[PDB]
Design a binder for this molecule. Sequence first.
Ligand SMILES: [Mg+2]
Ligand SMILES: [Mg+2]
Lengths: 255, 254
Amino acid sequence: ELEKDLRDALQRHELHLVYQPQVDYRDHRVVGVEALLRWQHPLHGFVPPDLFIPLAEQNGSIFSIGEWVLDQACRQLREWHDQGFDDLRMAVNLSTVQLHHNALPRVVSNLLQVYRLPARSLELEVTETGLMEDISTAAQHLLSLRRAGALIAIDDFGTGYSSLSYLKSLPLDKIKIDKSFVQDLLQDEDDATIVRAIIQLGKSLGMQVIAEGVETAEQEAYIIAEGCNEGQGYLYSKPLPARELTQYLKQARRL
Amino acid sequence: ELEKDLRDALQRHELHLVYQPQVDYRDHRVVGVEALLRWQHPLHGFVPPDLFIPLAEQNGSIFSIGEWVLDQACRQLREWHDQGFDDLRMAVNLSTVQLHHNALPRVVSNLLQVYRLPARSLELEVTETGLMEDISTAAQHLLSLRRAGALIAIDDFGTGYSSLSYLKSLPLDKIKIDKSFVQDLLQDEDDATIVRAIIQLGKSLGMQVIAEGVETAEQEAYIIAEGCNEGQGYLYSKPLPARELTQYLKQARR
Ligand SMILES: [Mg+2]
Ligand SMILES: [Mg+2]
């Protein structure tokens, strides 16, 4: 039922990473890339991450998959840095189980040393739900990750529960607006209100804000006018395999 | 013995209300009053509400106590309206267990009609913790309360967990900055950041913002500059018994 086929997946080389660029609106430059895990099974097609990551969390294999993801993402960043894009950031999502695994600080610190990555070049994305299960342990691990040189961002912001007390207290550097609000920006005006509110909440707390799911130039124009710092989504590029994002990044940085 | 004593505090008339005024910064005029429950035990003295309301929620006394508070508060609003303070609003705190009780909409609607109170004159204060206890039930009770003519405010904001999604979709009118962030305002700069953020979150979402715990004129100047709409705290008045708050209202509207 693929909850059984998931187990062979990494062994069968059925998992891979795709990469989505992130654009800074101060200079409209590509400044970061988000690594996204895919499972393309030869019989079933792509299996949604929202399906199989819960599966991996329940059978205790998510930490081993996450180790593989982090290694491949850090290696890919080192390759891109060596090609001249040495200010590029790499962002990697951490599932809730990973976030609360006490070996996560060691795994990340190892990779930052092994690939000799600059400070502030790896960003770890966590969700509001991940933080809420056990804010005590999450805070300890996030502080340790920041101490090792990683940045921390909150993914899918606005879809979970957050405490403003903890948002300012934690070592959080960036808020990512959930794409559900950005995608329907120009249509629903409660969605636009929440987009504007998240932007201003990031500004009020001294955090960068990135809009996910930017599909159209008119959406980009609206969020830039309201003060958003960065963007991600189809307007810039869908998620791409590494070889194709290398071409996109060289083309984007050419001029 | 404390939980035991609270079981019958209400027949023993050991509960009373005090009232704290609220000031609108658009014209620096008293626009509302918060009713606050007190329990002065004959042997123990004042028992903190943070102590006896969780006790009332476990032992089931909260329902009858809460109904008594709303009744006394609506009665006092009717008296002040008839004394010429026609537009005054009354604010009452609802505990989590109260907020999720099936009979809460009928209790509030009864009192609004019994005391012939105008629409938007009673404001019910709920906490983020109360909303997150069961967002489905909370949402339908809040919609019924608003449908009956009550206003809804989130009390102690910033100290619990909220969702921007639900803040916008619920029938909320007002956010109350938690007193702990305002008391630390001028000396502590991270709480100044939280205060600024809450005020701006309120503007962004189209909700009024009231600061609780305002103690000095410099704090008030800071929060108005930031866009705060209302204030409450020792700077205006500490909580007062009804006869002194009447004196306070009369003194101002001279
Ligand atoms: Mg992400
Ligand atoms: Mg209150």
